[PDB]
Structures are given as structure tokens and as C-alpha cells.
Structure 1
Amino acid sequence: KSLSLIAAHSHITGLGLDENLQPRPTSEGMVGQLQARRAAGVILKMVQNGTIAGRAVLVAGPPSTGKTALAMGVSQSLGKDVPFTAIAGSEIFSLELSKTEALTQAFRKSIGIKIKEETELIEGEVVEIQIDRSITGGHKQGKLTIKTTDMETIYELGNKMIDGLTKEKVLAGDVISIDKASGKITKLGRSFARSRFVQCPEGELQKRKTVVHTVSLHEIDVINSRTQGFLALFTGDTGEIRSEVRDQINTKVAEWKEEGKAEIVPGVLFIDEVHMLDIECFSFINRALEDEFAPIVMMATNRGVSKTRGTNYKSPHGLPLDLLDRSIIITTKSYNEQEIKTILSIRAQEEEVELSSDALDLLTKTGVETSLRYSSNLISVAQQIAMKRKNNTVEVEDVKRAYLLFLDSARSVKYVQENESQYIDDQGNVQISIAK
């Protein structure tokens, strides 16, 4: 289930918070940023209450300060059965959708409908099967014996049951699940009978089971549109769906909530690097946030007063002032030495690397000096140098060897800046020959 090697945010299991929304110094893989974690907990409670809609927040700060860490903490704290869409700023620039249509699809993918239905099922272990044919073979008669750990029974089979059991061949000792109303029968496995392997089912053979479904508004939008079927949810060619089916889906969902057959579960849309959208996308975002079915939008950006895309002026955070007028801004701060060493110790624990105290202090010093991500990349690559000399713990010599072998930004710029005749410049001028 959900295969993964090691992620860069794999230690963040959620927001470390109390019952009074207070951030602990070290909980759930998150350390530091107390006010930002408290604000994200307030936003989490805003999502979990579900009584308000279409509020946009902004996470702005210096790079490598844990904005994506905060977004992953909120996403893990939401848990399952709540929609969470995470897109980047370059994803909406499509060749077969418009930008407003892609933003609309991302908006409607973040809100879902919870529908509870019950289906009666039969699941047990097959004991013995008789298939009887007549002289001409026109009529087929059959008997099936199926049991659980608590009962045993014999069923008289009709013709379509016989054709459904002859197809996808079921033998004795096979554990199967039978849906009567749809005719679909699935083989669960084989029973533990030496004389895959699944145990025998228990309880009553005929169970009424309740399954809770969650379907987004974009799925019903795709199915309700007659131009393309449900296979466009996987192939990805929806192709500029009209607004009329959206209005019908809105009215149908409203009357379903009014009747009580279905509930609305709103979610979070996370936009990462929001500064690289055009001003048309921003203008669409201003007027898409006052709809009743609009999720809570999270944007993360790290720029200063820079040029907004598609314009010729400069704006704070790369966003226009009317977009920033409808936003509440959470600001993240840079880290200290203790927080950097705690982050590096947590990354050591997640990467199964045993570190000495002096190696950890050297990593902390070179992380304060250059970058946190540089140390978090060096810690995993020092373990292979340690394993080349056949010892388990990573010592100082391995970290110094990794620091010598792999450079960082500042040393690379320093090495380039007095060797620029060997590199291609802005004018395409380079010197290849060693002499002259």
C-alpha cells in the first residue's frame, strides 16, 4: 500500500499540536515555527468545521524555511476521505485546455460528496459443485454447497449462475464472493487446506454491508457531460467542458443535500509556486472564490517585490494587490542552530544512518554556514563512504570526504568566477585550447 522508498518530507506525520492548539517543540516530525504551526492548526480547524468556504491563505517566507513541510503537515493531519489537491504553477499551461478551464478543474477536484449505500453480499468457501446436463443439453441444472465457520448450506442454481460459475472456473475449496444483483463473482483466494491463501470467512453467509463512497465534483461533471465518458478521468482528454452541466450538477448536489441523501465534504487546494501564474489566472482566482462550492486555497511563494507574469510592473510577492486583499498571510522564519541540528537528527533517524556527536556538530556547522538542504543531502551520501571502509557509524572523515567530493552553491560560484574563460558566457564566448 502506497509504495515509496524515502521521501524528502517523509518524517512529517502531521502538525504537532495539543488539544488547545498549542505547538509542542518536537512532535510529529515538526520542530520550530511555532506561530506558523498555530496558524496552520487554525486553518485545519477551519477546514474541519466546514461551515465556511472560499478563503485563500498565503504562506510566504525565505526559501528552505518549511513551507512545503507545513503543507505536508496539514495534508497528513487531514487524514483520508477528504480531498487534497497539490498542483504547481507550471501545470496549468496546457496545450489542449485553457488556463481558466484547468483552474476550474483543479477547483472542482478539491470538493467531494459523501454517499452511504448498502449492498447485500455472499462470501464463503465452496465445498462442492454439481453441474447437470440433459440429454440434449438445452437445460442446465446445478447444486452448490458453500459454508463458513458457522454455517453450511446448499443452493439450487439457475442457468445464469451456472454460466457465471463455468466462466472464471471455481473449484472446491475456493473462497469466493457473490453479488446477486449484479452477477459479478470474484475469487478471494484458496482456503487453508493442504489435504495466495486466504482464511475461511466467519459469521453469516448473507451480509448486508454498508460502503461509504466519496466522489469529487469533477467526476460527476465528467460523467454528466455526454461528450466523453468516464475514461477521460484516466486518459485525461476532457476538453473544455461546458458550464451548463456544471450548473445542473450544482442544482442536483444542492437538492441532494436538501433531501439528505448526500453530504458535502470540502477540501484544500494547495498551489505551490503561485507566483508563476498569469494575471488572467489571478483575475479568475479572485472571482472563483465566492462560489458556494469553493475549497480553501493554500498558496506558497518565496519571491520578494518581483515582476508579475504577463505585466510590466512589479508587485509584492509576485501577486497583484487585489489578490492579496482577499488573503491572510502566514509568515515563516529562518532557523537557529538547535532547530537545524534537530532536523538533521530526525533526517538521520529516517535514513537509518547512525551518526556520531562530532559528525552531527560538523553537519550543523556546515548547515548554518551554507544551507540546510546541503547537509540533508550530504548525510545520506556520507553513509556510502562510511560503508566503503566497512564500518557502521559515520565519522568525521566521511563527512569531510563528502564535503570535498560534492560542492555547494557558493564554492561553485567562487570556482567559476576566476575560470570564466573556460565557461560559455552570455555572448557565447569560450576558450577551449589550453595554450594561447
Structure 2
Amino acid sequence: LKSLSLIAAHSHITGLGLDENLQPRPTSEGMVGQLQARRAAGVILKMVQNGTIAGRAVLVAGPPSTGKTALAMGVSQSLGKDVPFTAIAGSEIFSLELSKTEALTQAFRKSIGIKIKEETELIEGEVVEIQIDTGGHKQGKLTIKTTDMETIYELGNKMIDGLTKEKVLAGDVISIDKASGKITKLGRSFARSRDYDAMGADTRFVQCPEGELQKRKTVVHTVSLHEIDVINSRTQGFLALFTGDTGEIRSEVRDQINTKVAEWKEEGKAEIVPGVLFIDEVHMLDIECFSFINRALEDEFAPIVMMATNRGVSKTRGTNYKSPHGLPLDLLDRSIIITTKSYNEQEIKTILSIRAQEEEVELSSDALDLLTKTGVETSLRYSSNLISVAQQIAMKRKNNTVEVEDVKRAYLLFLDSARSVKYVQENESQYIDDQGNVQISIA
């Protein structure tokens, strides 16, 4: 209902096609193939909603375009609401106004959620009439009214002073805290609704409340730990969640608020919920961040952390050795690896068909087969991008269907990555080299 989306790169993924005993369906909710990875993801999910053990590291491997982010999107859709899911890439950790360790700590505190229950008692929209008086400390007893309920209440000097600030005719209905708080204007009644030829932005006509004004209602409140720390970081820091100037909060609010949340949990009025923190593009990161993650995995309030990468054995950012998987061996020791194999021709056909129907594109069978053949030759993302341009060129030819020749025209229009590489190889002199050498004189 609140989908402002035009599309998404993977919007067909809505949960995981599992069942009672967690068996991956062959095709369900924009997801095809890689059954073992889906079963592992379902196991991790059930672990997450178990919510009884923390500090687990799970790593997702695979070649490019294998759909490792597809699993993350699927599990995020599966868990849905009431559980935080922070999708963070590896590049935003580099801030020049905040230590990388501090940013990682903020992310970790973000992924943990806490809900609390609180109950307020208040009389709403019942202040009817003010009977001022002998003199001094006047209006010591005035009635209250709703559309269905009335009562007379006596007022003291303190309540007289409270009413003195922003005095009202009391012919309207005003809500005042019976819980020894303050007053809150609700608006104006219908009697004076036709009293102004011009309007403002201070008071608006308000309905007379229905039922008894007195009400002691309880409210649940959900918030993550990072916000609850930043709110006590300074005298007032509600802008920090908006402006973004956290300011590297010192490690005194953290432990004291951990003790506070433990006390709240023991009182039973607050319930914690361990969310999932997902990190895409992990292979670029500093070794200091890796060690900090190594330690932070041991914390009691450690959310489930899932990593995604595609590089194999390569240099790590911060060292001079080509470590396998792009990560230090220590981190690999304390993690769980879920490899993903390549994709198949039938899987390619199903994925391309799902993409085509996602953007409500009518596709001829032969054009779909040609797209599958190309996606076997080149990457599948190539055809998953060419589908839209083929639809556009078919529209330009005034035929609703995507004929084969339209797809061929789209293919001939845009170069393949390999085709572009080959053409550059043929025309090295024309382009500019890495040594600053280039030729522009044809003759």
C-alpha cells in the first residue's frame, strides 16, 4: 500500500519459497535455483526469530551476478516488520568526522531493537465552562463535559495557575493530564466555528469527545539501541538522528544504558528484539575494522551479522598479502560460509521470464529463447537490462509484442562488455593509454 517504488532491481523477491519443514520450492516469489543456499538462509532465519543466541557470523560467497544479494533481500522481506534490518555497504564506514570503529559501533547498536510499554491516564476534551469569582484563587470548581458524559471538578490554586497560562473560554473541549502533568489545547467547538472571516494556524475546530473523558491507556514503544543512546548523548540530541552529527559518543552512556535496559528487562516492562545487520561489499575494509568485528561478535547484544562478497584470493585493504576470500583467516575461522553455485539455462529462462512479466512486457517465445542464448553467452544482467530497451524499440515500431528483430536491434545498438573490450583492443591507438599517450592526428 505504501509502495512508492517505480521498480527495484530485484522487486519480485518477496520472502523465501519455503514451507513448514523448510523445503525450498523450485520457484516462488522471484527466486529460482540455489536450493542449498535458500535452505541455509531459512535455517538462519528461523535462528533469528528464535532470538535466544546472539553473536553469530554468517558469510555469503559466490561469483558476480550469482544472486547473493537476492538471498539478503529475500530474508529481509521474510522477516518483515517488527525486526530491524540494517543494509549497510562497506564504503560508508569511511567517515572523516567519525572513527571507523565508532561507525561500526553505531551500526551494531542500530541493529538491536527494544520495545517498552507505558500507560498514561488523562481526561480528554472536558473543561466545560469557567466560573470565575469572592476574588482571588477564583474558578475553583468548573464542570467537565463530553458528547456523552459530564462531571463537576474542583480546582486548586496550582490548577488555577495552570489554567491562567493560555486561558480559554472553556466552551470548547480541552484535554488535560489527570496524571499530574499539564494541559494541552485540543481546539474549538462548533458554536464558534462561524465566528471568523479569516483563519490562522493556532486553533482548529475540534469535535466534542465521545465517551468518558477519563482514560488510562497503555502505549507500546519500539526503538533501536543506537537512537536510545544518542538521545542521552547530550542534553538534547533528537537532531543527531536527523542531522547526523553523533559526535563520537564516549563510552559512558553505552554501559550505563546497557545496565538500564537490563533493569527494564528484569522489570518485564521492556522486551528486546535482536535484528539482523547485513553488510554488502565486505571485501573492501580495513584490518582494524576486521579485528573490531572479531571482538564485537562476543558482545551479549550482538545482532546476527551477514556478509556478502565475490572476490577470491586477493590482497586485503590494509596489508601486503593476498589472503584467500579477501578476508583475514581469523575472521574466516569464526564465521559460517554459504557458497552459491552458478546459474543454469532453465533457471536463466525462468529468471528472464519473471523479469519480463515484472515490467508487464509481452514477450514472444523466440525472442525469449534468443535472450536466454545471449544470457548464456554473456551475463544474465545483460539480457535483464536489454529487455526494457527491446520493449522500447518494439514500441517505436508500433508492435506491442517484443519481436525477435527488435531484440536483435537492441543487441546491435549496445555493446557487450567483452565486445567493448575487443573493440578497444582493435583501436588501442585511438583511446588514451595509462601512460597518458593518445593519438588524435588521423594522418
Shorter-chain TM-score category?
0.7 to 0.9
**Is contact 2:128–2:173 with CA below 8 Å preserved after alignment?**
no
- The alpha carbon displacement at 1:219 in A equals 1.1
**Is contact 2:137–2:160 with CA below 8 Å preserved after alignment?**
no
**Is contact 2:122–2:179 with CA below 8 Å preserved after alignment?**
no
CA distance in 2, matches of 1:416, 1:157: 88
**Is contact 1:129–1:142 with CA below 8 Å preserved after alignment?**
no
Q: Residues 153 and 343 from structure 1, CA distance in 2 versus in 1: closer, same or farther, beyond 3 angstroms? A: farther
CA distance in 2, matches of 1:126, 1:352: 58
Q: Secondary structure at the match of 1:86?
A: strand
> Cα deviations across residues 141-164 of structure 1 (Å, max 9, x unaligned)?
999999999999999999999999
RMSD in angstroms over aligned alpha carbons?
A: 4.3
Aligned to 1:289: 297
**Is contact 1:93–1:99 with CA below 8 Å preserved after alignment?**
yes
Q: Residues 127 and 31 from structure 1, CA distance in 2 versus in 1: closer, same or farther, beyond 3 angstroms? A: farther
Q: Residues 268 and 183 from structure 1, CA distance in 2 versus in 1: closer, same or farther, beyond 3 angstroms? A: same
CA distance in 2, matches of 1:143, 1:406: 83
Q: Residues 168 and 389 from structure 1, CA distance in 2 versus in 1: closer, same or farther, beyond 3 angstroms? A: farther
**Is contact 1:363–1:375 with CA below 8 Å preserved after alignment?**
yes
Query: Aligned runs of 1:180-329 on 2, under 5 Å?
Result: 209-226=217-234, 229-329=237-337
Q: Residues 177 and 382 from structure 1, CA distance in 2 versus in 1: closer, same or farther, beyond 3 angstroms? A: farther
- Higher Cα radius of gyration: 2
> Cα deviations across residues 142-199 of structure 1 (Å, max 9, x unaligned)?
9999999999999999999999999999999999999877999999999999999999
Q: Residues 184 and 419 from structure 1, CA distance in 2 versus in 1: closer, same or farther, beyond 3 angstroms? A: farther
Q: Residues 137 and 426 from structure 1, CA distance in 2 versus in 1: closer, same or farther, beyond 3 angstroms? A: farther
- The alpha carbon displacement at 1:107 in A equals 0.6
Q: Residues 144 and 61 from structure 1, CA distance in 2 versus in 1: closer, same or farther, beyond 3 angstroms? A: farther
Aligned to 1:102: 103
> Cα deviations across residues 253-305 of structure 1 (Å, max 9, x unaligned)?
11111111101100111011111011010011100110101101000000100
Q: Secondary structure at the match of 2:264?
A: helix
CA distance in 1, matches of 2:185, 2:84: 32
Aligned to 2:426: 418
CA distance in 2, matches of 1:23, 1:368: 25
Q: Secondary structure at the match of 1:421?
A: coil
Q: Secondary structure at the match of 2:429?
A: helix
> Cα deviations across residues 359-409 of structure 1 (Å, max 9, x unaligned)?
111111111110111111111111111111222221112111111111221
Q: Residues 422 and 170 from structure 1, CA distance in 2 versus in 1: closer, same or farther, beyond 3 angstroms? A: farther
CA distance in 1, matches of 2:401, 2:188: 46
CA distance in 2, matches of 1:26, 1:382: 26
**Is contact 1:119–1:208 with CA below 8 Å preserved after alignment?**
yes
**Is contact 1:274–1:299 with CA below 8 Å preserved after alignment?**
yes
Aligned to 1:22: 23
> Which range moved further: 226-235 or 14-23?
226-235
Q: Residues 183 and 331 from structure 1, CA distance in 2 versus in 1: closer, same or farther, beyond 3 angstroms? A: same
Q: Residues 254 and 412 from structure 1, CA distance in 2 versus in 1: closer, same or farther, beyond 3 angstroms? A: same
Q: Residues 49 and 414 from structure 1, CA distance in 2 versus in 1: closer, same or farther, beyond 3 angstroms? A: same
CA distance in 1, matches of 2:138, 2:151: 21
CA distance in 1, matches of 2:261, 2:140: 46
CA distance in 2, matches of 1:365, 1:197: 67
- The alpha carbon displacement at 1:120 in A equals 5.5
- The alpha carbon displacement at 1:138 in A equals 12
Q: Residues 224 and 128 from structure 1, CA distance in 2 versus in 1: closer, same or farther, beyond 3 angstroms? A: closer
CA distance in 1, matches of 2:325, 2:353: 33
CA distance in 2, matches of 1:350, 1:333: 25
CA distance in 2, matches of 1:199, 1:390: 57
CA distance in 2, matches of 1:131, 1:346: 74
Q: Residues 338 and 123 from structure 1, CA distance in 2 versus in 1: closer, same or farther, beyond 3 angstroms? A: farther
> Cα deviations across residues 109-157 of structure 1 (Å, max 9, x unaligned)?
000111123446788999999999xxx9999999999999999999999
**Identity among equivalent pairs (%):** 100
Query: Aligned runs of 1:136-155 on 2, under 5 Å?
Result: none
CA distance in 1, matches of 2:151, 2:183: 18
CA distance in 1, matches of 2:126, 2:418: 68
**Is contact 2:356–2:387 with CA below 8 Å preserved after alignment?**
yes
- The alpha carbon displacement at 1:421 in A equals 0.6
**Is contact 2:57–2:304 with CA below 8 Å preserved after alignment?**
yes
**Is contact 1:174–1:187 with CA below 8 Å preserved after alignment?**
no
Q: Residues 383 and 257 from structure 1, CA distance in 2 versus in 1: closer, same or farther, beyond 3 angstroms? A: same
> Cα deviations across residues 220-243 of structure 1 (Å, max 9, x unaligned)?
111222266221111001111111
Can you give the 5+ residue segments of structure 1 that lack an aligned partner in the other structure? none
- The alpha carbon displacement at 1:48 in A equals 0.4
> Cα deviations across residues 61-88 of structure 1 (Å, max 9, x unaligned)?
1111111000001111111111111111
- The alpha carbon displacement at 1:212 in A equals 2.5
> Which range moved further: 227-236 or 65-74?
227-236
> Which range moved further: 78-87 or 185-194?
185-194
> Cα deviations across residues 330-365 of structure 1 (Å, max 9, x unaligned)?
011111011111111111121111111111111111
**Is contact 1:126–1:171 with CA below 8 Å preserved after alignment?**
no
Can you give the 5+ residue segments of structure 2 that lack an aligned partner in the other structure? 194-203
CA distance in 1, matches of 2:413, 2:376: 20
Q: Secondary structure at the match of 1:303?
A: coil
CA distance in 2, matches of 1:43, 1:83: 15
Q: Residues 138 and 366 from structure 1, CA distance in 2 versus in 1: closer, same or farther, beyond 3 angstroms? A: farther
> Which range moved further: 245-254 or 381-390?
381-390
> Which range moved further: 399-408 or 143-152?
143-152
Q: Residues 362 and 226 from structure 1, CA distance in 2 versus in 1: closer, same or farther, beyond 3 angstroms? A: same
**Is contact 1:222–1:233 with CA below 8 Å preserved after alignment?**
yes
